[PDB]
Design a protein around this ligand. Structure first.
Ligand SMILES: CCC1=C(C)/C(=C/C2=NC(=C\c3[nH]c(/C=C4\NC(=O)[C@H](C)[C@H]4CC)c(C)c3CCC(=O)O)/C(CCC(=O)O)=C2C)NC1=O
Length: 378
């Protein structure tokens, strides 16, 4: 009926863009408009299971904004994620009655008291959670909260489920486009670095920009390059730098020959407590290192540095972070917990980024070896 026309229009709106942010904003807005509820949100999960409120629509100021909030994976037990990975919608109509209805696509159960206390503390009277699948995994959740009690029609449930399936498809296609674009940008960065590597300009001028653009494309707070080959011993830096002893460290752990690419977090430097502490006194929390050695002989070292991942977000820009709404008590505690897990942990680099590091390192090693052999034959 008019239901199918509504689903058609909303699906057109969700699928209009291949940009993930536009997809999720259209999703939350359209679903909140359909349901008339106070707050509709999308929670996205990371590989470790931690959740981030990545999109949000509100009908007014009755419920506070949670956009940008992050919470530890443990806030949703694996027992709940099991049901969600088996495609399962969960509605709590009354928080005071503590009822929990569970429905499948295509009658009342109890609910854990801790989650009831959580929803009460946020001033949430009614909750509807629909899972968002990506291939076989649980990409995230579509969440509708309301400050007064309200039931949910079965046709409302099926409309939200069908919209969730369209959201899943849009997520997959946006991912296809994003992977293509990232592959393009990575190859472009490799070639742009090679453009400056063999350039006849002053090495200190070109290589500093090389390190700067390398740090840029790998979202690193800094970059460093130490060449120690034949008669050439040089050190170029950009951005945040480690203590100089780091260089000597890389020379004494060469057996961990040839060329390689390695990742390290601050935690991985537990063996060397003095270097670990010096590194701590630095914003550096992650290191991507490439031993420049295209030939069998070691040539140098190329490093990119990332900070702690928590610092990568302007948490003070959010309303929930600074303003003392009591309903933000338990969410903020959750955030605190998450902050305790990622206060010294960096964002890891992908396998594609490590391969990029390896390729840039091969270019660097070959270039330096060629130049030094040409200067030694003189
Ligand atoms: C963005 C702010 C926010 C957070 C963080 C949040 C947490 C949260 N707790 C959930 C469930 C759950 N959470 C818990 C347990 C707990 N959870 C805790 O934070 C405690 C540490 C612990 C109790 C001691 C349990 C047991 C469930 C499953 C409840 C059930 O369906 O029976 C779910 C899954 C949705 C659902 O099935 O209702 C979410 C999203 N909800 C929000 O809106």
């Amino acid at each position: 009926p008019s239901r199918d026309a509504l689903i058609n229009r909303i699906t057109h709106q969700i699928r209009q863009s291949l940009e993930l942010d536009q997809i999720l904003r259209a999703t939350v807005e359209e679903v909140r408009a359909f349901l008339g509820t106070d707050r509709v949100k999308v929670y996205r999960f990371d590989p470790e299971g931690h959740g981030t409120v990545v999109a949000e629509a509100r009908g007014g100021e009755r419920l506070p904004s949670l956009l940008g909030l992050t919470f530890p994976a443990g806030d949703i037990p694996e027992e709940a994620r099991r049901l969600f990975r088996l495609a399962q919608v969960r509605v709590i109509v009354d928080v005071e009655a503590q009822s929990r209805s569970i429905s499948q696509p295509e009658l009342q159960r109890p609910v854990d008291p801790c989650h009831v206390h959580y929803l009460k503390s946020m001033g949430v009277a009614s909750s509807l959670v629909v899972p968002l699948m990506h291939h076989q995994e649980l990409w995230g959740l579509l969440v509708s909260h309301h400050a007064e009690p309200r039931p949910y029609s079965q046709e409302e449930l099926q409309v939200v489920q069908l919209l969730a399936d369209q959201v899943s498809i849009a997520i997959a296609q946006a991912e296809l486009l994003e992977q293509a674009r990232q592959k393009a940008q990575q190859e472009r960065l490799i070639n742009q670095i090679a453009a400056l590597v063999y350039s006849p300009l002053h090495p200190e001028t070109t290589l500093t920009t090389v390190l700067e653009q390398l740090a840029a494309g790998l979202q690193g707070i800094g970059a460093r390059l130490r060449i120690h080959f034949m008669g050439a011993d040089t050190l170029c830096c950009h951005g945040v730098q480690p203590p100089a002893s780091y260089d000597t460290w890389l020379q004494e752990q060469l057996g961990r020959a040839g060329g390689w690419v390695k990742m390290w977090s601050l935690s991985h430097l537990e063996k060397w407590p003095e270097l670990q502490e010096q590194m701590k006194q630095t914003p550096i929390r992650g290191l991507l290192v490439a031993q420049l050695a295209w030939n069998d002989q070691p040539v140098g070292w190329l490093s990119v540095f990332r900070g702690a991942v928590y610092q990568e977000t302007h948490w003070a820009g959010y309303r929930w972070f600074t303003q003392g709404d009591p309903r933000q008590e338990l969410p903020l505690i959750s955030f605190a917990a998450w902050r305790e897990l990622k206060i010294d942990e960096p964002k890891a680099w992908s396998a594609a980024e490590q391969e990029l590091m390896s390729r840039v390192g091969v270019h660097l090693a070959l270039s330096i070896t060629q130049n030094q052999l040409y200067r030694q034959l003189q």
